[PDB]
Amino acid sequence: EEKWVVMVTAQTPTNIAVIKYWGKRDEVRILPINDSISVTLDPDHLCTLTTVAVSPSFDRDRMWLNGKEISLSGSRYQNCLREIRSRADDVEDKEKGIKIAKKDWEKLHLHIASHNNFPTAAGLASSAAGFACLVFALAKLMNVNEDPSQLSAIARQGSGSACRSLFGGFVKWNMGNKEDGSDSVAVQLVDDKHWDDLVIIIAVVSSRQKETSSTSGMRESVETSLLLQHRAKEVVPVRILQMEEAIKNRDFTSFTKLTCSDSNQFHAVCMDTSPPIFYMNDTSHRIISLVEKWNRSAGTPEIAYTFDAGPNAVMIARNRKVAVELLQGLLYCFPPKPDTDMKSYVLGDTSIVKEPQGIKDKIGSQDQKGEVSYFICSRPGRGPVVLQDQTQALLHPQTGLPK
Amino acid sequence: EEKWVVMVTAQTPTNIAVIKYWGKRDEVRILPINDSISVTLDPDHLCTLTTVAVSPSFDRDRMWLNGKEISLSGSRYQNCLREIRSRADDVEDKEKGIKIAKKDWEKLHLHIASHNNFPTAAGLASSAAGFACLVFALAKLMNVNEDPSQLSAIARQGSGSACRSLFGGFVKWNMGNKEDGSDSVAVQLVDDKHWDDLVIIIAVVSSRQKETSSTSGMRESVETSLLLQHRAKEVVPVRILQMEEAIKNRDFTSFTKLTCSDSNQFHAVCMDTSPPIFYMNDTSHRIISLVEKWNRSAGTPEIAYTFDAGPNAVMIARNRKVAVELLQGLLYCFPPKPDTDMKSYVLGDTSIVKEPQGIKDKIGSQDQKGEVSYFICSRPGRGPVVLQDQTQALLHPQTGLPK
Numbered sequence A, B: 001e002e003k004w005v006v007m008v009t010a011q012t013p014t015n016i017a018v019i020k021y022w023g024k025r026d027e028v029r030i031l032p033i034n035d036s037i038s039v040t041l042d043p044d045h046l047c048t049l050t051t052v053a054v055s056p057s058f059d060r061d062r063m064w065l066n067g068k069e070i071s072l073s074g075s076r077y078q079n080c081l082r083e084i085r086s087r088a089d090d091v092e093d094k095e096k097g098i099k100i101a102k103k104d105w106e107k108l109h110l111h112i113a114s115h116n117n118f119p120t121a122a123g124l125a126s127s128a129a130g131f132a133c134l135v136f137a138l139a140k141l142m143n144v145n146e147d148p149s150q151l152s153a154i155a156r157q158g159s160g161s162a163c164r165s166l167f168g169g170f171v172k173w174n175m176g177n178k179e180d181g182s183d184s185v186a187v188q189l190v191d192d193k194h195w196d197d198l199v200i201i202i203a204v205v206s207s208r209q210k211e212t213s214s215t216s217g218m219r220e221s222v223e224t225s226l227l228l229q230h231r232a233k234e235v236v237p238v239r240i241l242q243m244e245e246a247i248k249n250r251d252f253t254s255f256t257k258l259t260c261s262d263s264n265q266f267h268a269v270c271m272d273t274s275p276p277i278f279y280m281n282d283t284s285h286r287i288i289s290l291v292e293k294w295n296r297s298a299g300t301p302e303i304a305y306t307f308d309a310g311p312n313a314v315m316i317a318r319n320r321k322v323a324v325e326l327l328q329g330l331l332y333c334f335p336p337k338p339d340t341d342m343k344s345y346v347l348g349d350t351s352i353v354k355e356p357q358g359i360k361d362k363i364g365s366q367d368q369k370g371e372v373s374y375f376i377c378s379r380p381g382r383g384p385v386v387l388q389d390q391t392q393a394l395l396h397p398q399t400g401l402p403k
């Protein structure tokens, strides 16, 4: 048998919902009970990088995540692979003498290696950027003839939030109304330049509490929370329309009202679940109080917050001057562990990190030390991209096994 | 002018809602948006003791709470005084030569002194037992001809939860539907003997966070929480009927499902408020996790929890053997501050306090020290009573001023 190896490497950003996805109506096709809207983040310290490879000499589909092999046996990987394979087409690399016929893909096995630049015990959705990257890279590999919105639908079957990482900027996942899920897809609302002033600051919060997974948790809520249905039918459709308008016109005050309140309502549904799900901790509450105080002592709002399925705070600053104030604010309230290199305790961006009483005004009181593990600054970012520089591939170009 | 002094002293227990009151439809008459149901606790370490006095020589209405004079100027005191005075009748103490004509009450001023046996910075509703006691004692003083249910309605105007402390046992506050509030009253569901097996354990949790008041908080929720209306119209009416049946038939499993879930849903509405209200802290969550684990590792439920407008946990044990296990459980997970007299760290009851691996089974892991300030054990209790023993009066029988 032949031993050529075709591979593709892609880099895919993560995203952060400002109007939240919580609860499915279909556990197999992954269709949600409401729309959601998110912001794609800049790749640095947040993206997932993935290399996919096909060879007639691979005996098995196999996958590696951050160095360790893992199972593709599960339904989420099995459904993406199946859907993308079924759309594979003729490929031909003439320089290398390789012709793959459409039918060949029914038997060619795949090797996938993937790397998450978010620290793994830090707590950010690895799944979102990850299934989006897999789908996007495989779609290049197999010459699938489909736009990002249709590819959205495949990524969605690996993880619901993954479908929103196929575009940059601000992205809407439409819940769709067809049974087959074909219209449950993401679409870009605006690109990453429309609102380039926003700066994002993630507080990765210390906690050893292991968090109920988003998939199980939201299933539990659909099954036991008597408030979720009312959220889904009567609250979120309206919030979707207001958030669209707020993004269109960069109304940061409307954007702040919506983001904070939809995050809080999502955590309210989690508390109304039986047994209750507690994703925020006392540090989380302390960050919200800081943000709400800071905004009251500045009249018009300067900072929004949102929280996913954990205590990590995501803060969104109206612009860079706010970001610089806030970052000194946050360092006062969340001083580090003793002997801590500030190069390690505040990742991202560079210019803002390199940069005071009038701030003590807006925050008030200092906290105990080390409630925060570290901060990450970022920005709205573009969508996924292919990497042509093979130095960045994670599979060996000849063995098809992890470097 | 004359200088006789007529006084009455009464002792009134506090109560604990298992189906929660949260939100008014009338801020003046204090009418709620849903029914509520509570359990009256045994008086020890929980009651409020009040002495009321009238004399022609008092120039002013005045009141003392735990030693300190306070203002009666506010609407809550002004509305109770006004309502009870308007129902005053002819009084006559023949031994002392005192005749009070109905009309005299329009001019006689009152002295009130009151004492809360809950520590004041501990965090229990002083208001509930307090306005109930005031109304109950004044109703005796002024010879009002009204049953506890009608007196309920007056206490309600001092504090909504106060109306439920006019009966022992399990008590329902009916939301009523008349504009004048006359049918918004409490009624006893069963007395304190019907379910005498229940043991109650209150964890008074350490926290310096000052809590948003119940009155302001629930106003904020009515104004900003989009889930509250659905709770009030569609969740609670059904829970009221199930909780009635569960109390009637001492179904502790149904009672546990309802109590935990209605407490959690109340805190969910608080989180859905803008700005959010956080009454539970990380200690609170740790107690819920202990209770949920303990119940799973015992099959049928043995312990219910509920939380009011603060982090204090109220636990309700199916019976005394459970209570004794749990209390050793709680001491393992919440060890005291160093050098702490266990006579001070666990109040109440006596027999159960005086009373182990097989329990390590049900709780798991130990916590840091001093997360709990102290525990209080109690039981379902009777309603308010008059004290005839003048040694217990808080006003001096001749000056009408605080001892």
Ligand SMILES: C[C@@](O)(CCOP(=O)(O)OP(=O)(O)O)CC(=O)O
Binding pocket: A016, A017, A019, A020, A021, A022, A030, A036, A125, A127, A158, A159, A160, A161, A162, A214, A215, A308, A309
């Ligand atoms: C709380 C959220 O982050 C939900 C994340 O859900 P997942 O995308 O992880 O769930 P599955 O579809 O089961 O894979 C809010 C959001 O991203 O919208």
Ligand SMILES: C[C@@](O)(CCOP(=O)(O)OP(=O)(O)O)CC(=O)O
Binding pocket: B016, B017, B019, B020, B021, B022, B030, B036, B125, B127, B158, B159, B160, B161, B162, B214, B215, B308, B309
């Ligand atoms: C959370 C609760 O304890 C509400 C207490 O409310 P208050 O009775 O204190 O409020 P006001 O009527 O304004 O005086 C739940 C309950 O007791 O039902």
